Amino acid sequence: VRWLAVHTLAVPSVFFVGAIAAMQFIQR
Amino acid sequence: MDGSYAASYLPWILIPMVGWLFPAVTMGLLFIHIESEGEG
Amino acid sequence: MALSDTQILAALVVALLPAFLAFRLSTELYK
Amino acid sequence: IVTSIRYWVIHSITIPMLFIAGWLFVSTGLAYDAFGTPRPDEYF
Amino acid sequence: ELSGQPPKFGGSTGGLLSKANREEKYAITWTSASEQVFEMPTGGAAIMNEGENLLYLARKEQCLALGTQLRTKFKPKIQDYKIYRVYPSGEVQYLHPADGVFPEKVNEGREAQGTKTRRIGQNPEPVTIKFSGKAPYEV
Amino acid sequence: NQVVQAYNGDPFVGHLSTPISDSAFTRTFIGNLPAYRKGLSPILRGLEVGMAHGYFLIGPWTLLGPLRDSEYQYIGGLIGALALILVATAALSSYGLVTFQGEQGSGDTLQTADGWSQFAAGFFVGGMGGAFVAYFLLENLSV
Amino acid sequence: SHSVKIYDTCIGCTQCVRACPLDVLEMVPWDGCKAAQIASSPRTEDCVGCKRCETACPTDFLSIRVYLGAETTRSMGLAY
Ligand code: CLA
Ligand code: CLA
Ligand code: CLA
Ligand code: HEM
Ligand SMILES: CC1=C(/C=C/C(C)=C\C=C\C(C)=C\C=C\C=C(C)\C=C\C=C(C)\C=C\C2=C(C)C(=O)CCC2(C)C)C(C)(C)C[C@H](O)C1
Ligand SMILES: CC1=C(/C=C/C(C)=C/C=C/C(C)=C/C=C/C=C(C)/C=C/C=C(C)/C=C/C2=C(C)C(=O)CCC2(C)C)C(C)(C)CCC1
Ligand SMILES: CC1=C(/C=C/C(C)=C/C=C/C(C)=C/C=C/C=C(C)/C=C/C=C(C)/C=C/C2=C(C)CCCC2(C)C)C(C)(C)CCC1
Ligand SMILES: CC1=C(/C=C/C(C)=C/C=C/C(C)=C/C=C/C=C(C)/C=C/C=C(C)/C=C/C2=C(C)CCCC2(C)C)C(C)(C)CCC1
Ligand code: SF4
Numbered sequence A: 001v002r003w004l005a006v007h008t009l010a011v012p013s014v015f016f017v018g019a020i021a022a023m024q025f026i027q028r
Numbered sequence B: 001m002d003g004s005y006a007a008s009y010l011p012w013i014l015i016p017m018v019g020w021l022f023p024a025v026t027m028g029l030l031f032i033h034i035e036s037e038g039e040g
Numbered sequence C: 001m002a003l004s005d006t007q008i009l010a011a012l013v014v015a016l017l018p019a020f021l022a023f024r025l026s027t028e029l030y031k
Numbered sequence D: 001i002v003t004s005i006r007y008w009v010i011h012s013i014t015i016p017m018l019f020i021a022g023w024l025f026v027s028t029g030l031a032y033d034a035f036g037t038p039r040p041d042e043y044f
Numbered sequence E: 001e002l003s004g005q006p007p008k009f010g011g012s013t014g015g016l017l018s019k020a021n022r023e024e025k026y027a028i029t030w031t032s033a034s035e036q037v038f039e040m041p042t043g044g045a046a047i048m049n050e051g052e053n054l055l056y057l058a059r060k061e062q063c064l065a066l067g068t069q070l071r072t073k074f075k076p077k078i079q080d081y082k083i084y085r086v087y088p089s090g091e092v093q094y095l096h097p098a099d100g101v102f103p104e105k106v107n108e109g110r111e112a113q114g115t116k117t118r119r120i121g122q123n124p125e126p127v128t129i130k131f132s133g134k135a136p137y138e139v
Numbered sequence F: 001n002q003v004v005q006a007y008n009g010d011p012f013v014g015h016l017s018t019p020i021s022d023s024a025f026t027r028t029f030i031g032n033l034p035a036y037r038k039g040l041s042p043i044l045r046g047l048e049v050g051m052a053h054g055y056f057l058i059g060p061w062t063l064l065g066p067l068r069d070s071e072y073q074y075i076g077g078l079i080g081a082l083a084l085i086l087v088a089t090a091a092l093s094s095y096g097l098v099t100f101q102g103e104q105g106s107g108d109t110l111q112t113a114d115g116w117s118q119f120a121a122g123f124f125v126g127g128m129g130g131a132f133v134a135y136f137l138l139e140n141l142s143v
Numbered sequence G: 001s002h003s004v005k006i007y008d009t010c011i012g013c014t015q016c017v018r019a020c021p022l023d024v025l026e027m028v029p030w031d032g033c034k035a036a037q038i039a040s041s042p043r044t045e046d047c048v049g050c051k052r053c054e055t056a057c058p059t060d061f062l063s064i065r066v067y068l069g070a071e072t073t074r075s076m077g078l079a080y
């Protein structure tokens, strides 16, 4: 349903963008 | 707040970014840069 | 007649280019 | 009504903790370990 | 290392801070013939012992102010005060007096550094030494 | 008799002994705080500190905030507390990044880059926990 | 640190040395004046630029000049 249709994309995207945000700092 | 101009949703997100997100990010980066020791 | 929202979005997309050019110029001037 | 309140509460619990979970996952030695990606020190 | 016998003082809040044990501190030692009262440059008055005394301060100016007070504000004057710089690693550098003779009087063995051989009115013009990273006095 | 003397036996330091600077009750109460306790991991220190500091922040917006009149009152307080704790964690992380980026020691595990980062993460999660438990206590029904 | 320079107009009057509170100046032997002594600044790294030495100088304009430059912990007179 619409609930899954939105959450299946939303719930990993925030995780991934937080990951990339941290990688933007982990670089020496 | 809302208006009758086209794309009325643009201020809703643009103004908070230019008011909170952008200043927070630039002050954070500037604070990090001005404090990096060495390489004078 | 008033502008269309597509015009506003296109204006933002166009304004993306001077932002990138300004970033490049500032980084060049930093050297 | 109360439904919007619960919607806001549910969307406030999860988003920050998810972002911070991602930040913690890649900040510690977990991203390299799980995915097999080598850390820059080991490179030869 | 150094001597001891600190002056009898009740302490104050105007003394040392973190820098003392992180960057440097200063020590001043002197021998007094009587157990008397002097004025601490950090606020308040303290009793200095009869014999040798050692005092730790945070700035060289404070040590030299106490030295001035010792030299001038006592009828039996004090001329043997010594000022050292105490590094956080325990290394102690003897600062004042440099050669043991007071700087106010001429003495042999000095190098005469910092002296220009010209008048202050004969300094080079700023424009002529442009793009040299030096001001007119530096040349 | 004299309740005021030198600070920890050295008068020449810039401090004085007071019934609140080195009293037994003062040292006992301070030494047992989460930021100063013994044998506590930095992550758990941060969790404990953040729990309280986010619990108490729920107050002012609920009673004085712009939404205090409406039913969206405790929610407004919760949102304000969450935003404040988020900005607090960002500031903590920035301080940790800029402070201990030089030489690293393990004499104090809080005063090191990894220790401070763990402190910040635990502080974040504790802030969320405390703010949410405060909201659950204050907010009526909604269950 | 600040730079303290002594020019050839000094008369060996020693006022500058006594006026200095941080022990930067010194009296050295010389021949260009009647007093046969001149001022030197061996410890300029301890000078705070308080300009007391210049205020004590009696010669026309100043035989001793102080130019303020890079500020360190010593030259800023910090106790913390
Ligand atoms: C320098 C020119 C300028 C200025 C002062 C403003 C000012 C404003 N714009 Mg605007 N805008 C501009 C150019 C400008 N605009 C241009 C060229 C575009 C086309 C892309 C837009 C598109 C635009 C939209 C779509 C919206 C605004 C909005 C706003 C208002 C919200 C605050 C803001 O700027 O953030 C938002 C504005 C932006 C993110 C625009 C990007 C900045 C432009 C493109 C370049 C500015 C560069 C500038 C020279 C940098 C100088 C640095 C200096 C301070 C040191 C504010 C009155 C909002 C509004 O009206 O709310 C009611 C809104 O929704 N602007
Ligand atoms: C809005 C401000 C505010 C408030 C209300 C609190 C509240 C709290 N903090 Mg907190 N904190 C704050 C800002 C604040 N914090 C800031 C800005 C920082 C950054 C440095 C911290 C860092 C911090 C740490 C690191 C810790 C706390 C802790 C605590 C809790 C225990 C109280 C405490 O620290 O002992 C009270 C405060 C002190 C003992 C500090 C000295 C305060 C002065 C000197 C008191 C003067 C004495 C005087 C004689 C008293 C009588 C005066 C008058 C009544 C006559 C409590 C929930 C502790 C905790 O986790 O608890 C669970 C803890 O370990 N805080
Ligand atoms: C000190 C001055 C002051 C005070 C007390 C207030 C008070 C208030 N303002 Mg306001 N404001 C001020 C100056 C002030 N304002 C200024 C200068 C501006 C800009 C010109 C604004 C702009 C502004 C806006 C735009 C809005 C407010 C709003 C509010 C209300 C709720 C939001 C709030 O502040 O709580 C939120 C909570 C905090 C800001 C943080 C709480 C800080 C805690 C309580 C400190 C406690 C310290 C602790 C006790 C130390 C002891 C610890 C010990 C026990 C261990 C509240 C009545 C909002 C409103 O409409 O409400 C009616 C709103 O929308 N203000
Ligand atoms: C365990 C995690 C989550 C749960 C259980 C959850 C639950 C829900 C529920 C019950 C709804 C229905 C309310 C509504 O549609 O108005 C909803 C809607 C929504 N959720 Fe989540 N949520 C979670 C996480 C997230 C996250 C992290 C995002 C990030 C963007 C997200 C995005 C959305 C969006 C955009 C909607 C609106 C749907 C619509 O308008 O059709 N969700 N969520
Ligand atoms: C008690 C204590 C200590 C002593 C503290 C004392 C005596 C006083 C402290 C007072 C303090 C820290 C007050 C703090 C006030 C904070 C305020 C007023 C914050 C306001 C925030 C607002 C209104 C935010 C608004 C917004 C948010 C949250 C956003 O994210 C963006 C939007 C917006 C701007 C609206 C010390 C000794 C410092 C440490 C010890 O551990 C604990
Ligand atoms: C992707 C995409 C979309 C959205 C696009 C969006 C959202 C675009 C946003 C654009 C923005 C936000 C543009 C911002 C522009 C900023 C500019 C042009 C800044 C210029 C600065 C200049 C010229 C000079 C600065 C300076 C110089 C030179 C220095 O040396 C130092 C001082 C300083 C002043 C800094 C949508 C979905 C619609 C459609 C699909 C494609
Ligand atoms: C980009 C752009 C631009 C620019 C902009 C800028 C540059 C901005 C800045 C920004 C900024 C500048 C920001 C700021 C912010 C801030 C904040 C956000 C703050 C907050 C605060 C608060 C929150 C407060 C609180 C308080 C206190 C502290 C005390 C008293 C009380 C009260 C509560 C009030 C322009 C215009 C050209 C336009 C185009 C684009
Ligand atoms: C521990 C703790 C805490 C604390 C925290 C912290 C410690 C914080 C910090 C914070 C910080 C530490 C922050 C910082 C900030 C910064 C800033 C805000 C900056 C700004 C900037 C600017 C202003 C800029 C300027 C400029 C420059 C510099 C150059 C160019 C130009 C310009 C102008 C741009 C809390 C309370 C939470 C709680 C409890 C625990
Ligand atoms: S005060 Fe002037 S004239 Fe006298 S000794 Fe010093 S530099 Fe020479």
Ligand code: SF4
Binding pocket: G004, G019, G020, G021, G022, G023, G024, G025, G046, G047, G048, G049, G050, G051, G052, G053, G054, G066
């Ligand atoms: S400026 Fe002050 S500290 Fe420097 S030499 Fe002159 S009197 Fe001494």
